[PDB]
Amino acid sequence: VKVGVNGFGRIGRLVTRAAFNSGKVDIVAINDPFIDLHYMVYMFQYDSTHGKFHGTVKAENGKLVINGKAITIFQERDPANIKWGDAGATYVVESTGVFTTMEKAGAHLKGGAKRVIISAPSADAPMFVMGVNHEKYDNSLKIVSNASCTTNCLAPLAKVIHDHFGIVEGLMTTVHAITATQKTVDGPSGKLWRDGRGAAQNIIPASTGAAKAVGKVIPELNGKLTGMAFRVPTPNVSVVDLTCRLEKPAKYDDIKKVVKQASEGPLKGILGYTEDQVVSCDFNSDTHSSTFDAGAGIALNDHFVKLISWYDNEFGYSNRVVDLMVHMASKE
Amino acid sequence: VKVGVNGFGRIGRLVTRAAFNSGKVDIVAINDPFIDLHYMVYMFQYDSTHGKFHGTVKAENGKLVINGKAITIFQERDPANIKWGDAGATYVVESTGVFTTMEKAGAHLKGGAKRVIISAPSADAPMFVMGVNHEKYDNSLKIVSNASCTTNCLAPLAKVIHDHFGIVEGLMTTVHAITATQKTVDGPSGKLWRDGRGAAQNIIPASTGAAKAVGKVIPELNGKLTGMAFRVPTPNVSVVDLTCRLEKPAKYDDIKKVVKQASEGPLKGILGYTEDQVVSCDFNSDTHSSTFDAGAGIALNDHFVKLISWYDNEFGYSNRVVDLMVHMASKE
Amino acid sequence: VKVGVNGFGRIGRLVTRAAFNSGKVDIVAINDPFIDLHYMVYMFQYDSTHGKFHGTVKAENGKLVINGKAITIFQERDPANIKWGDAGATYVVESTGVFTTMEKAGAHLKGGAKRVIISAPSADAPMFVMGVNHEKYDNSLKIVSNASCTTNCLAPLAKVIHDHFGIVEGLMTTVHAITATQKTVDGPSGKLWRDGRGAAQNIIPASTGAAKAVGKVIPELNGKLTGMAFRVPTPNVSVVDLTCRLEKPAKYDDIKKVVKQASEGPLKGILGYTEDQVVSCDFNSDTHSSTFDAGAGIALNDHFVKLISWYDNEFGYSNRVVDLMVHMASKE
Amino acid sequence: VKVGVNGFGRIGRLVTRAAFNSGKVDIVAINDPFIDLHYMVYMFQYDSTHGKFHGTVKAENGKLVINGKAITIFQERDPANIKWGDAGATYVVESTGVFTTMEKAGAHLKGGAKRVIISAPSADAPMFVMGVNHEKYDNSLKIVSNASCTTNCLAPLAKVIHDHFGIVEGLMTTVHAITATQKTVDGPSGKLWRDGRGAAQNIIPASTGAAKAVGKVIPELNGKLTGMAFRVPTPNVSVVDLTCRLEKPAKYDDIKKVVKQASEGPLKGILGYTEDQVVSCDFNSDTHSSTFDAGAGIALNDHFVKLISWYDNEFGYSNRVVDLMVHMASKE
Numbered sequence A, B, C, D: 001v002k003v004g005v006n007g008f009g010r011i012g013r014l015v016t017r018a019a020f021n022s023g024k025v026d027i028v029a030i031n032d033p034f035i036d037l038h039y040m041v042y043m044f045q046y047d048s049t050h051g052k053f054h055g056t057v058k059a060e061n062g063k064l065v066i067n068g069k070a071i072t073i074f075q076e077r078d079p080a081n082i083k084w085g086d087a088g089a090t091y092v093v094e095s096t097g098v099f100t101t102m103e104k105a106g107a108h109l110k111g112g113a114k115r116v117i118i119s120a121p122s123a124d125a126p127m128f129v130m131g132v133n134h135e136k137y138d139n140s141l142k143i144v145s146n147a148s149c150t151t152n153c154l155a156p157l158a159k160v161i162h163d164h165f166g167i168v169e170g171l172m173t174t175v176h177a178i179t180a181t182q183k184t185v186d187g188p189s190g191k192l193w194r195d196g197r198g199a200a201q202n203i204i205p206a207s208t209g210a211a212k213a214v215g216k217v218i219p220e221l222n223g224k225l226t227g228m229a230f231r232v233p234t235p236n237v238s239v240v241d242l243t244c245r246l247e248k249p250a251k252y253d254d255i256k257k258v259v260k261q262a263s264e265g266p267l268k269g270i271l272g273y274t275e276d277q278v279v280s281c282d283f284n285s286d287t288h289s290s291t292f293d294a295g296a297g298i299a300l301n302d303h304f305v306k307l308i309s310w311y312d313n314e315f316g317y318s319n320r321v322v323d324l325m326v327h328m329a330s331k332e
């Protein structure tokens, strides 16, 4: 399926690498009014976090050419003005952070795009998490959301746990790497005042919709989970800390057994499982949505447990965006 | 009371500062075989985290003279060889990190100390938290513990919440600054493998006895709390995240009022209360044991809540060591 | 003199603090369209780097009241629309970073300011360094620059060394803390590609005009000095490394004596001198422009030496802005 | 050639990976009294900086088995007691940091080792830098030094520059990643007081022998270079900043031309060359000893220049150790 990328950022650029790396998505157009063509070459080829592109990248005849494939480059602030159709972009990855409502994201349809995948939670577009509810997608849906990085780590763990023991209620904290929304030194950050404080210096409490959004992705959990985040001074890789109360009793070893099972079978590639003495860097460029850390968790009793799961918030999510598009493409 | 300090490290130095900032306590001797007299002048004067000492520090006549007061300096590896009695050290703060059992900390009694306060949890020395169970101290105790930084954070809060609502069960996480036991790059840590991984690079899961220890300090909570830690790349200040289930219903505003009431009366100076948009650096050099962050916590319902509390692990704890000694002295 | 501040950022806030810590200067107005009145109360009160403000800050009656003094608050993007005259702002500190030419900074003259001090180098506004060429200021200058933090570090030192030994030629590097222009993760920086790379992850080469600018401030050194920068993952405090060739022979002890003599007389408060085993944090909130580090430099021979000098880029510079205004006012 | 590794640290473990990766060195014995066998598995397989070993690692029948090759594991504090000969270890990589003199390093010969390669500068063992003076090695030399990471970055650049233009004199600064000798928080560090200050917080001035040691590796430069270091808060990758005065005039483009030439021909794989807008992370796991950064340098005039060269201090040096051993092996 051919695809356009709106906003060539962390997710835009890594969705582009994941795309090249799958057989199944062809990136044909990129719009980013803040990154010109020769600058796009540089930002793609060099990556502080995930390392140099293993691949070829250049500018040629006004097009970005990756691994010999030529890509139409647009420079539009208003997505309503992007000539996607002409470019041959069937689906658009809305990865700017700034067009997340159906109405705003729907502007890509005016340039002749067929479907939009918003790389974030949406107030009103339907949200999908691969492995959890993607099969609820149907062809009527022109504008969809891939949810967040955090919702993609929480939801698969929660699916497995609810399915086997019943989640009565749960409260989630994510300890999360810094992102591009944050500031290098104490600076302005709108109505979210904590988010402006110096990102390298501080542990920063923040809001997250992800626990509530899981109750959308798994309706039986509606209103049973909420949570929060702490931003901390690492450049990538985040961890979910789920504290939950269960209906059926669950010894820790039975939780481990059932998560290992799921990681090996129907959630292979999405939910991982480890008992190794891992730290955050051990997941850098790991493509899973969620990896259970057996050693790090702790149970108070058979009904009350704290479960820990790792995620590369850039790289895992990026791969999920590709996967959703493949799934959508195959339903057309 | 005259005090000697064993281990002139982060805690030993900051206890010394806190002692001089308050005449609460007179420092008369210090032992550290890895820091000579001239070198102590340097390490006490300049502090990366808390700034340059406001006062005078020099070497005269083989002693360390802080604010005009001469301190006897020892250089012994074996605590049994330190002549505390000769120097007048009545109470000894045991802040090396390697003598935390009664048997080992007791060696100070050999050199003529009268009582020992271990600046960490102990497998067997009784543990005290100022404002929670410090009145359980009595003069029959020659060797006591001031518990851990984390316990001093969690306990005052857990007391208020338990006293007023009844904690049925709780799971804790502390997102904690790096300490001297950690490593600059991947290196040997012995039995605790994750802890040897590069401190500036990683989110590192780690073990903590604080939640259990709360059940000693608050006997009604015995066996009702457990937890874990994440070490993250900050140099100081940490945060407790307590997820608890309550017996009696408590609306979040009722929790706020109760906690604020507690900060203003009996736990004043120990448990603080804030509604501001704070981040970790706002607690650097803050002397509270625990500061409840109203805005950062979140309730799922009237019986299931996540409560957030900040602590300067270095500075709050060091002030508590002095306060505990002052109390002890009053009981003599 | 009454002062208005345009851009209530790292420098604008710290100038404000320095003004209140010294009555040197009265702050009467502040403009920042990205920080409302209530939000200013927050950002001024809490500072990750320099700590909580010691004094009072609140909003009353649409003004910002610091230490009892009410300050008029504007929210204009266009400096021409700020009514400085109505608020009584005689001098305007232009600390936004986006109005550094005479033509742009001059727009403050439209709203009724009398003179403008740009808190950065200027392509055309004359530049002054306290203790080096501030007596070249005269009342014919409506728009002046206080140069850069780096220039304020390099110039006092280069003056002493030149005055006494004759700098034939020099090459400078500054190893410099991160600033607000940098990015938390790899992102767009426009024309300056290295600067958009993740600030907490990298050693980043960067351009600096400081060495050349020294040749304006010290006309005899015109064309005799150039340099570069490395941005590194600290939040504050930077260091000059000046490698120079000398005309007259200077033994390193002669250099030390000359510099120390300079710190004790005419450049006292501007150029500091130390022999202690200092590191960057020992200069956090230090008001000097430049602190010579005797121990850290090294001579190849009597004519070829590497000289090291520390500066708090935020705090030293901010104090210099106030000092420059006080001087200006004395000349009126 | 079969080899033993004394000290399985950063360099010990990466020399081991580089060894597997060449065809030509077989690691057969490892001694490290602080890392037991199952711990060795973990420390080899997981690397925060260079990523998971792409390879197999396990413990079997009391031996460390990497990629099917079994390795004898010793646990001796005194290298005089290590049974290398029995193990079949012909050469030993002395990578503990603690046996760097001929006499101390010579203890490995008592256990039947034939030659020792000390992974650091030595006060008295002869030092080699591949590409610069390795051909001065002869079979009489049983104990040698591979110099330092910094000497390996400086010396190839200096060779090329001296060869073409004449280095009259030079002064070098290295801006260097933290290492395992440094401390996570302000702590003791012997007679080198700065080195104990908190490594994540500070820019730290330090000593280096590397500029002087280049005058050993290139005798014509004896007494013509010296320098210093700054340690800064990155976990790996360092940069040399060489300020030098030249005999023959050299336009910057002629310097670039001659370094590019050398990187392409006789210093291929040792000295690299780039004009890209690179930052430190772009060299992570780069095997060169030295990569010239054309864009980052700056010339004052044709005789006085500042040259910049990057190095992965762990990975580049590690590969050089292997290379030296191959060279030594082929001269036997």
Ligand SMILES: NC(=O)c1ccc[n+]([C@@H]2O[C@H](COP(=O)([O-])OP(=O)(O)OC[C@H]3O[C@@H](n4cnc5c(N)ncnc54)[C@H](O)[C@@H]3O)[C@@H](O)[C@H]2O)c1
Pocket: A006, A007, A008, A009, A010, A011, A012, A031, A032, A033, A034, A035, A076, A077, A078, A079, A095, A096, A097, A098, A119, A120, A148, A149, A179, A180, A181, A313, A314, A317, C186, C187, C188
């Ligand atoms: N970083 C993560 O870990 C992560 C994970 C999952 C989802 N997301 C979400 O993805 C979105 C992007 O996140 P990111 O981290 O890549 O941000 P980023 O800041 O790195 O990238 C955003 C890009 O959008 C471009 N842009 C801005 N306005 C534009 C416009 N009008 N038209 C075209 N391009 C424009 C910017 O120039 C930039 O290159 C956000 O909604 C974020 O919440 C982020």
Ligand SMILES: NC(=O)c1ccc[n+]([C@@H]2O[C@H](COP(=O)([O-])OP(=O)(O)OC[C@H]3O[C@@H](n4cnc5c(N)ncnc54)[C@H](O)[C@@H]3O)[C@@H](O)[C@H]2O)c1
Pocket: B006, B007, B008, B009, B010, B011, B012, B031, B032, B033, B034, B035, B076, B077, B078, B079, B095, B096, B097, B098, B119, B120, B148, B149, B179, B180, B181, B313, B314, B317, D186, D187, D188
């Ligand atoms: N840093 C914190 O946040 C914190 C807070 C609460 C409690 N603690 C506890 O306090 C203790 C000290 O921790 P720290 O962070 O100050 O560590 P540290 O490493 O900064 O200080 C320990 C000091 O003890 C010295 N020492 C080692 N062996 C010695 C001996 N045989 N005799 C005398 N001195 C010796 C070392 O030279 C060092 O100066 C530990 O038990 C720790 O768990 C630490």
Ligand SMILES: NC(=O)c1ccc[n+]([C@@H]2O[C@H](COP(=O)([O-])OP(=O)(O)OC[C@H]3O[C@@H](n4cnc5c(N)ncnc54)[C@H](O)[C@@H]3O)[C@@H](O)[C@H]2O)c1
Pocket: A186, A187, A188, C006, C007, C008, C009, C010, C011, C012, C031, C032, C033, C034, C035, C076, C077, C078, C079, C095, C096, C097, C098, C119, C120, C148, C149, C179, C180, C181, C313, C314, C317
């Ligand atoms: N941080 C330092 O080390 C340092 C030292 C010396 C000089 N400087 C210089 O001082 C200036 C400010 O740097 P800073 O570090 O404080 O940056 P900053 O980003 O912290 O502050 C700039 C402030 O200006 C505001 N602003 C942006 N557009 C505006 C407008 N149209 N009108 C009014 N305000 C506006 C922003 O909201 C922000 O509060 C820059 O020129 C910088 O080069 C910085």
Ligand SMILES: NC(=O)c1ccc[n+]([C@@H]2O[C@H](COP(=O)([O-])OP(=O)(O)OC[C@H]3O[C@@H](n4cnc5c(N)ncnc54)[C@H](O)[C@@H]3O)[C@@H](O)[C@H]2O)c1
Pocket: B186, B187, B188, D006, D007, D008, D009, D010, D011, D012, D031, D032, D033, D034, D035, D076, D077, D078, D079, D095, D096, D097, D098, D119, D120, D148, D149, D179, D180, D181, D313, D314, D317
């Ligand atoms: N890290 C760098 O970038 C770098 C580069 C070039 C050279 N070097 C040099 O290499 C040497 C090691 O450096 P490193 O960074 O790997 O240090 P490291 O601390 O990571 O490794 C040292 C290892 O030696 C072991 N060890 C200590 N005493 C021992 C003994 N008596 N017998 C056996 N093993 C023992 C330790 O347990 C540890 O695993 C030093 O001389 C250093 O100067 C380091």
Ligand SMILES: c1cnc2c(c1)ccc1cccnc12
Pocket: A001, A002, A024, A025, A325, A326, A327, A329, A330, A332
């Ligand atoms: C045209 C282009 N791409 C596709 C299809 C048709 C049909 C199915 C499909 C499934 C996965 C990925 N791409 C496609």
Ligand SMILES: c1cnc2c(c1)ccc1cccnc12
Pocket: A130, A131, A266, A267, A268, A269, A270, A323, A324, A326, A327
């Ligand atoms: C587990 C892992 N991968 C997948 C699924 C479940 C479901 C659908 C799908 C579609 C495309 C690519 N991967 C997956």
Ligand SMILES: c1cnc2c(c1)ccc1cccnc12
Pocket: D001, D002, D024, D025, D325, D326, D327, D329, D330, D332
């Ligand atoms: C035995 C073992 N290894 C070797 C030799 C003999 C001879 C030469 C040589 C050259 C490079 C690497 N290894 C060897």
Ligand SMILES: c1cnc2c(c1)ccc1cccnc12
Pocket: D130, D131, D266, D267, D268, D269, D270, D323, D324, D326, D327
């Ligand atoms: C440039 C690059 N690699 C080398 C040399 C010079 C010289 C010797 C040598 C021996 C073994 C492996 N590599 C090299």
